[PDB]
Write a protein that binds this ligand. Structure first.
Ligand SMILES: OC[C@H]1O[C@H](O[C@H]2[C@H](O)[C@@H](O)[C@@H](O[C@H]3[C@H](O)[C@@H](O)[C@@H](O[C@H]4[C@H](O)[C@@H](O)[C@@H](O[C@H]5[C@H](O)[C@@H](O)[C@@H](O[C@H]6[C@H](O)[C@@H](O)[C@@H](O)O[C@@H]6CO)O[C@@H]5CO)O[C@@H]4CO)O[C@@H]3CO)O[C@@H]2CO)[C@H](O)[C@@H](O)[C@@H]1O
Ligand SMILES: OC[C@H]1O[C@H](O[C@H]2[C@H](O)[C@@H](O)[C@@H](O[C@H]3[C@H](O)[C@@H](O)[C@@H](O[C@H]4[C@H](O)[C@@H](O)[C@@H](O)O[C@@H]4CO)O[C@@H]3CO)O[C@@H]2CO)[C@H](O)[C@@H](O)[C@@H]1O
Ligand SMILES: OC[C@H]1O[C@H](O[C@H]2[C@H](O)[C@@H](O)[C@@H](O[C@H]3[C@H](O)[C@@H](O)[C@@H](O[C@H]4[C@H](O)[C@@H](O)[C@@H](O)O[C@@H]4CO)O[C@@H]3CO)O[C@@H]2CO)[C@H](O)[C@@H](O)[C@@H]1O
Ligand SMILES: OC[C@H]1O[C@H](O[C@H]2[C@H](O)[C@@H](O)[C@@H](O[C@H]3[C@H](O)[C@@H](O)[C@@H](O)O[C@@H]3CO)O[C@@H]2CO)[C@H](O)[C@@H](O)[C@@H]1O
Ligand SMILES: [Mg+2]
Length: 755
């Protein structure tokens, strides 16, 4: 390019910057092609073009002007790229603002969609505000190969779609532009199918929806509703290894943490809206908005000292009772709690407080609700047609045909959508086994094997590995967490080593062992010492997340205090002990709302949490305890930097099962960071209990769960103890401790202390 062309851009004299900016073909070779990407980034001193699916990065050179950049690349096709932009000392990664000339689908868009590789198909399918033939309007587009006709119905045409019949393209996608309408437009797709029957359907790629039980889609100008502020956060994420950082997740179901009065409107960000009543049986109650939650949930979480919030699903879902796990609008956050901008606001604010957001994501199945994807075009479009692989009969739900390109594309792009438009920091996937196995919840004669006669679901595995490959490529530094409950190997290991590509897996065995353990009378724990110690045999085969989730305090399993035997005092001590042992055991951490203040009732998705308990000491003491434990978690690198390496953990002694006692070390880079952890899992205190340590010195009591201010009896070691030249559990020096009742001690060597 010439300097005249650049100056036209710089001084706002150029007629159409799309001629010059963005990606442009220069020439075609035998094997490959020469492209140039061009960018005008004011205030940027440097820029690169990332080709994350190819694992490459090229620098852009300033050209004719310091903020005008060109960068030439040879590669056959250049569909997938981002720009990294440096502005002083900060860097952001973003998609090219000049990627798409026009709002309609190009040959290239469609071609890619049909291979199932259009990672930004959500820019073209759905409904989008744009200009065509010189008029502002909305472009609508939908995948429906076998429909006989489709039309767009909505507010703008009194739900009569005769003047709004869509044009079928390439035998696959229906489109229509509608002028003069824009964002706020309420709409659906009238579809007539193969056999003449005419249903009405929500937009699969819709970005907003009416409040349930209504299902019409709404048009959103998704790129012009919210200003973000989290460039710093995103940069820190992109450049860090979340595996070597503290991760304590507060697990939350938004619709049931706290409610408000239906007697008043729901405040949004600079706006307000009608209240969403929580049930016809609790009509005085309303949901809080994403806006109100950002004001209340975030400071609560920040104070408690959790590093993350993990949401039960928030994709639009029609029945509160599914908890979210049965989704019908994959590409819209639920309208229960307000508008997309309001959720954007929530995430921005989590980030402003250095808290990340993880989203429960539901790619495994969808419900038969007819407004949704089921039998979309009058065929088995999204779901497989064989019910032996396309239904989950016990659940009454449909399974996506992962081998069908446009279906795979729907989900792969959807995951990418949430990181893109909503800036989220990770995902969790429920019940991965449901995807992996071709015989999941099926009995003999009722399922067909793969082509090699295995039970493995080849298409599902491919899909999961694509998801995790792309996600880490486009957004490094994120968390992809899996619950998979069947010994399937390498779940949280890399795709190149034949993993599924998650970087964390819920340790379900641990959970079961821990809760089964704590549930047993203390006297009898001596027969079950192996619940404590078993986990560490298999531990290092995966990067484990230690979760005590929502699923464990429903369906008459009781809340955590409920599971514990003994009187009220012992009940609380068992919680402190379990959770202190959890925060010291190797792994990342997850716990669910209400666990942190001792809720007695099981979690009930139809009400909010029993917040009135916080007005009584025991609950407040327990909440303080969790506040201090989180604070310690974050301040003690031996507790997070080597979670997944041998160096990080070694048992001191776990053989005194008659007293249910176990002891261990945790380690970091620095040897002065090493911790001694001593657990006593019965109400019997111990007066002169010797533990072996590896070095002489004063060991400080860093933490002691029996402290008075946590509800404990206040037995302990008065702040620390001098080690002895006295060999024990195979170590040179040793400690003669007071072990408090149902308690855990965390001690650290202070090598700069006065003998
Ligand atoms: O996260 C929770 C919380 O945990 C820790 O603090 C708690 C601590 O673990 C717990 O034991 C207690 O400690 C308090 C204590 O309540 C106070 O009384 C005060 O203790 C002083 C004590 O009054 C003095 O007697 C003096 O102790 C002397 C002993 O009297 C001597 O006999 C000798 O002790 C030896 C003992 O007799 C023998 O059996 C031998 O085998 O071993 C002993 C070695 O000590 O020497 C001591 C040393 O002076 O001095 C005490 C210190 O002033 O203060 C204690 C510490 O605050 O309650 C704590 C709070 O609930 C953790 O340290 C906190 O950071 C953390 O917040
Ligand atoms: O007049 C045009 C033709 O119309 C009819 O064929 C249709 C099908 O009925 C449609 O449902 C559609 O099917 C696509 C499908 O959408 C797409 O995913 C892809 O399917 C792949 C699949 O991903 C892959 O895993 C493997 O199974 O192979 C499949 C086949 O390639 O492609 C399908 C077929 O193109 O497309 C056409 C066109 O609308 C009619 O039956 C034809 O006889 C007729 O010529
Ligand atoms: O200093 C006096 C005593 O010190 C030590 O007692 C310990 C116990 O060994 C621990 O088990 C624990 O006691 C708990 C007890 O386990 C729990 O069930 C509960 O019992 C209370 C009860 O709630 C209360 O209403 C009434 O029954 O009194 C009981 C108290 O004895 O609560 C206890 C804690 O308050 O902690 C104590 C104190 O550290 C020591 O072992 C005893 O020899 C000694 O007498
Ligand atoms: O004040 C008018 C009216 O508006 C609200 O209902 C709207 C719903 O959001 C929506 O479902 C849509 O209704 C259409 C259906 O979606 C469609 O499938 C088909 O059956 O036609 C319907 C319109 O005739 O739009 C309605 C109407 O605006 C509100 O909930 C109503 O109670 C209120 O009376
Ligand atoms: Mg309530």
């Amino acid at each position: 390019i010439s300097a005249d062309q650049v100056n036209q851009i710089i001084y706002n004299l150029h007629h159409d910057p799309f001629e010059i900016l963005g990606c442009h073909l220069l020439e075609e070779g035998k094997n490959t092609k020469k492209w140039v990407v061009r960018a005008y980034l004011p205030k940027a001193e440097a820029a690169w073009v990332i080709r994350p699916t190819e694992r490459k990065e090229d620098p852009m050179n300033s050209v004719h002007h310091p903020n005008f950049f060109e960068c030439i690349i040879e590669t056959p096709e250049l569909n997938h790229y981002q720009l990294k932009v440096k502005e002083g000392e900060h860097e952001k990664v973003i998609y090219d603002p000049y990627a798409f000339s026009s709002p309609y689908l190009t040959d290239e868009d469609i071609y890619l969609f049909s291979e199932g590789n259009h990672h930004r198909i959500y820019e073209k399918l759905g409904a989008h505000v744009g200009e065509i033939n010189g008029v502002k309007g909305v472009y609508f587009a939908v995948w429906a190969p076998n429909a006989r006709n489709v039309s767009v119905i909505g507010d703008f045409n009194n739900w009569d779609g005769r003047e709004h019949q869509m044009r079928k393209r390439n035998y696959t996608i229906w489109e229509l532009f509608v002028p003069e309408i824009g964002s706020g437009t309420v709409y659906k797709y009238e579809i007539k199918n193969s056999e003449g029957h005419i249903y009405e359907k929500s937009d699969p790629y819709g970005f907003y929806r009416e409040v349930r039980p209504n299902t019409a889609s709404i048009v959103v100008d998704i790129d012009n509703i919210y200003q973000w502020h989290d460039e710093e956060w995103l940069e820190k994420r992109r450049n860090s290894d979340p595996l070597k950082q503290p991760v304590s997740v507060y697990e939350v179901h938004l619709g049931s943490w706290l409610h408000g009065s239906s007697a008043e409107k729901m405040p949004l960000l600079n706006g307000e809206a009608d209240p969403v009543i929580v049930s016809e049986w609790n009509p005085g109650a309303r949901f809080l908005s994403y806006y109100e939650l950002a004001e209340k949930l975030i400071p609560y979480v920040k104070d408690m000292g959790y590093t993350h919030i993990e949401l039960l699903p928030i994709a639009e879902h029609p029945f509160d009772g599914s908890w979210g796990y049965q989704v019908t609008g994959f590409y819209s956050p639920t309208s229960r709690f307000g508008r997309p901008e309001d959720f954007m606001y929530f995430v921005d604010k989590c980030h402003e407080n250095g808290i990340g957001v993880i989203l429960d994501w539901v790619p495994g199945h969808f419900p038969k609700d007819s407004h949704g994807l089921a039998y979309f075009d009058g065929t088995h479009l999204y779901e497989h047609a064989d019910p032996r692989i396309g239904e989950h009969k016990e659940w009454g739900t449909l399974v996506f045909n992962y081998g069908r390109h446009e279906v795979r594309n729907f989900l792969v792009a959807n995951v990418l959508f949430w990181f893109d438009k909503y800036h989220v920091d990770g995902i969790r996937v429920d019940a991965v086994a449901s995807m992996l196995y071709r015989n999941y919840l099926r009995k003999e004669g009722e399922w067909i094997a793969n082509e090699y006669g295995g039970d493995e679901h080849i298409e599902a595995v491919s899909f999961i590995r694509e998801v995790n490959t792309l996600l880490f490529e486009y957004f490094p530094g994120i968390l992809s967490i899996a619950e998979e409950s069947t010994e399937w190997e390498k779940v949280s290991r890399p795709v190149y080593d034949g993993g599924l590509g998650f970087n964390l897996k819920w340790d379900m065995g641990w959970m079961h062992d821990m809760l089964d353990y704590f549930n047993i009378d203390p006297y009898f724990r001596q027969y079950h010492q192996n619940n404590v110690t078993f986990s560490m045999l298999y531990y290092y085969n995966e990067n484990f997340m230690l979760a005590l989730s929502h699923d464990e305090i429903v369906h008459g399993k009781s809340n955590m205090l409920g599971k514990m035997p003994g009187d009220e005092w012992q009940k609380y001590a068992n919680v402190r002990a379990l959770f202190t042992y959890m925060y010291t055991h190797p792994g990342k951490k997850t716990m669910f709302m209400s666990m942190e203040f001792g809720q007695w009732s099981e979690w009930n998705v139809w009400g909010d949490l029993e917040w009135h308990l916080l007005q009584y000491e025991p609950h407040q003491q327990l909440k303080q305890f969790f506040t201090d434990l989180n604070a310690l978690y974050q301040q003690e690198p031996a507790l997070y930097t080597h979670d997944f390496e041998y160096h990080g953990f070694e048992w001191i002694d776990c053989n005194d099962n008659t007293h249910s006692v176990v002891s261990f070390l945790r380690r970091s880079d620095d040897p002065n960071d090493s911790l001694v952890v001593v657990c006593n899992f019965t109400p019997q205190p111990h007066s002169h209990y010797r533990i072996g340590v590896p070095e002489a010195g004063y060991y400080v009591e860093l933490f002691n769960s029996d402290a008075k201010q946590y509800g404990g009896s206040n037995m302990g070691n008065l702040g620390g103890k001098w080690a002895d030249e006295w060999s024990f559990h195979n170590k040179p020096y040793s400690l003669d401790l007071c072990l408090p009742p149902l308690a855990v001690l965390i001690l650290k060597l202070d090598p700069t202390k006065v003998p």
